[PDB]
Chain length 308, copies 2
Amino acid sequence: GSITQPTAINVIFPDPALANAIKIAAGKSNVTDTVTQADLDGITTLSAFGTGVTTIEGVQYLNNLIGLELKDNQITDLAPLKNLTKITELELSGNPLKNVSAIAGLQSIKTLDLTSTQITDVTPLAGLSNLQVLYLDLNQITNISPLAGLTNLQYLSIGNAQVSDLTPLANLSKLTTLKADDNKISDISPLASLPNLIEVHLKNNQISDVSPLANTSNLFIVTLTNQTITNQPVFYNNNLVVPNVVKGPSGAPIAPATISDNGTYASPNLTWNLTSFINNVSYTFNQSVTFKNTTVPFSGTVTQPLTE
Amino acid sequence: GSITQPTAINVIFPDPALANAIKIAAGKSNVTDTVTQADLDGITTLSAFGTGVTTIEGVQYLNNLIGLELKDNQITDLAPLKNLTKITELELSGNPLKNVSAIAGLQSIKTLDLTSTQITDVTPLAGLSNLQVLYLDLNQITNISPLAGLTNLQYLSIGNAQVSDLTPLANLSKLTTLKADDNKISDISPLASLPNLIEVHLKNNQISDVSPLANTSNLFIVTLTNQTITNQPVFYNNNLVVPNVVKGPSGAPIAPATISDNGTYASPNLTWNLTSFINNVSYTFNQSVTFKNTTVPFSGTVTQPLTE
């Protein structure tokens, strides 16, 4: 519906912090001042970072709202957004949302920040086909399949989540910045089909082979340190020979920097001469590698579990 | 012209490092092996970072070349590129180019890295209307006027140059990433017209007023520490009253953190009670400021020269 007659700001917006934000946005001097629907239709952005907002009740009257920035509040219910149709930027970082089902029909959205919103499922984003910038950092998200159809995506941040499978990114051809530090990524093969990638952050994952990025011609920033690789188990025995899964941009194996248990290397295999059973063996690597444009450090630890 | 008959790679490419790069790109086993024009027309990328290339003679036969990546070489002459028409990515970082007049007609180029190329003038880029990604870091460039017509620009890096005037960026509406640390930027007013800016790096400039970024709704990363501000001179006298030029995102003055010479502050003015002539007075500031989406540190030093 609409605001029929002039009504006090803080009657339409029950949240006292939000009401003061509306008061300022409307150019009024007191939250008790009346506003009309005209007034409300003149509000295109509403911002209230760190102001203790608990409810967005009222925002359903901001027909012309383009940007809503409510970072680090206590918002739990996004129903008031359901019928908004001009919103292109939505910043809800640091709110205890738990789910974002309510934003599924908001197709106008181009930029969306859901960092630290206690969400696990991004199914509701599958239909946000106009998305260009997306933050999902600091959420226990394990599956990004619903992003696969986001073909306008240009900037994707998913740091500090639980992502492994990057196959959903394969057709996101406009991607230029991918931030995915501290996840569970082991295979980056899907990145090969992203020819515009400029910046890729993959520190602290489980990546052994960086050759999928060797042909990315727009690639200028790439972080690859501190990978933690765990191999599938092999049998313990005296003459232990294990292929080295760590590959550089050319696809050739990377020589280990250190090897546990007095082991040796002869590309492509590590060899250990063991006489007693141990849970595992391991090695480290740290080498400058060279991609299409530049060179950076690639490092990590490989653990090889052993079976008796 | 064209290669008429099969000719040895290292007869077409006199540079021995480049010849070996062509040998690999062509799938041959020796730089003396012949190639045909067909062979050459099948080469779409050529890369030779850190290989001591001194000449790109021969590349004029790579009609279908899309990407040329020659970072950290000793190349001085870019004439061989003049008639290439499919090149979209050109990486010439760390070559003693001195000028880039030769690339002016290369309108196909979308991504160009000229970091550390000893250049001073970017007039030759004015016609590269398809440019989306540009690096000019680590060049004594003082004027970026020739960039003004680069309306497809999305990613601009100009760190460690001598840039002051950002007016040329005003109409670059597609800009999303601007990297401009360590320049001579004092006024960032032109940034107000860039509504898509996501990342802006402005550490170590001379910026006093950050209010031009207050309405940038897509802005998520902004660096603003260590500004070095020098005011225009004022007269020395006993009762010295000086308006505070340092403004936060709202446009209101930022209270100083420290003030020289036992001075005091009453917004908007610093006051010093001096009895002897000194070259100048100064103050520091360091405050968390809040933009549309997030909050970051804004800090620096202001020096006020005094006249007798």
